[PDB]
Structures are given as structure tokens and as C-alpha cells.
Design a protein around this ligand. Sequence first.
Ligand SMILES: CCC[C@@]1(CCc2ccccc2)CC(O)=C([C@H](CC)c2cccc(NS(=O)(=O)c3ccc(C(F)(F)F)cn3)c2)C(=O)O1
Lengths: 99, 99
Amino acid sequence: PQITLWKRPIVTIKIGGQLKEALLNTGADDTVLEEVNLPGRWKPKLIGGIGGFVKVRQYDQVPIEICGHKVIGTVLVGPTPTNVIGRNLMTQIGCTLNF
Amino acid sequence: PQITLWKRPIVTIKIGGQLKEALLNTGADDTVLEEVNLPGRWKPKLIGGIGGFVKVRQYDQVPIEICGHKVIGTVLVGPTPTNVIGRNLMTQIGCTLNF
Ligand SMILES: CCC[C@@]1(CCc2ccccc2)CC(O)=C([C@H](CC)c2cccc(NS(=O)(=O)c3ccc(C(F)(F)F)cn3)c2)C(=O)O1
């Protein structure tokens, strides 16, 4: 689809058997979620944002279906305000900016 | 143009007679810059980010030319991991997401 930017570009995702909403964020290198329950090993990561730095769990090779498109990649889990889909996943669904 | 997301979507801007680079950020409601020297009155604002909250100066009706497109809108000035162009300005240049 084409999505305009008069409102937040929020989409429905399925991850780890759970349904969430998340923001398509071209400013984010990475994908950051909260309150998801991912299986298996992870490693600590620190990421920077507006407001400071955040400690997250880094989970690799995680299946996630984003607006009906199945992809796999790294998902960070930690205490973000809104769920964010970053460029690491947006490239996998073929998303571009256009003006 | 069309811009893919394999790298950060960075564009050149002119604001207040100075040249900067900034990140096209569909996750950001607002536009946040640093090191800009804007004229005249401003109001304090607090904004939330993934890592906490930031105190910024809010300047209204600021001319800014973003990749050669002249627009006007609110610009927030304060700390950020990088200069960010948010949806408030991206709608004015007719930017959309497409997948
Ligand atoms: C003004 C934008 C503020 C924003 C708003 C988040 C939000 C939205 C709705 C409701 C509440 C909160 C959006 C955003 O992209 C980030 C930053 C980048 C500016 C962000 C988002 C996601 C992850 C990261 N960390 S990172 O390691 O992937 C990373 C670090 C730095 C940058 C850089 F390009 F900005 F430098 C991009 N990515 C940062 C942020 O900190 O919060």
C-alpha cells in the first residue's frame, strides 16, 4: 500500500504468536518492541534515542509478520514508549519513501 | 525522488541561512534539530523519545527548505542523536511510505 503521514504510520504485526501494533519508523536503524515474549537466548544491547540510551534484549532471527508480509530479523525488546519497526525490517518488505 | 531504506534517509536542508543534514523520520511527530540559531521568540517544550524526555525550544512558522522544497512549520531545537525531520514537515513535501 501507499501510506501518507498525516497520522502515525501504525501497522498490525504478529510476532511470537501474539498480535501487536507498531510504528513504521524510517529514522530507526533497528526494531524495538515491548511486552513480546520471544523464546530462547538473547544478548544485551544498548541503543541510543531521543532522551538517552535504553537497555534492551537483542533477539536474532525472529519471525515477524508485518502488515501481512512474513520476514525474519533482529528484534530488540525493552522499555520503549511505542513499538517501532525500523529499517532492518522495512527493507525486507520493500518499503521506500517517495516525494 | 524515491528513497530506499538500506541506508539512513539523510537529506540536505537550509534553515536560518545555514546548511545542515537531517534524517527523514516517519516515526517522529515533530522536527528536532540542534545547532540552528533561529531568530525571535520561542516556547519551552518537552518531548518524549525512546530513551527518555528532552527539553527543547519550540519555534513556530520557521522557513525550512528540505531537499530543495520550501516549507514552513514548527521546529524544535535541542539534543537529539541526529537532526530529525518529522511528519509535521514531511506532509508538506508530500512524502509517503510505499510497499
Ligand atoms: C522525534 C522522534 C522521536 C522518536 C519518537 C518515538 C515515539 C513515537 C511515538 C510515541 C512515543 C515515542 C522517534 C525515533 O525515531 C527515535 C529514535 C531515532 C531518532 C530511535 C528510535 C528507535 C530506535 C533507536 N535506536 S537505534 O539504535 O535504532 C538508532 C540510533 C540512532 C539513530 C539516528 F539515526 F537517529 F541517529 C537511529 N537509530 C532510535 C526516538 O528516540 O523517538
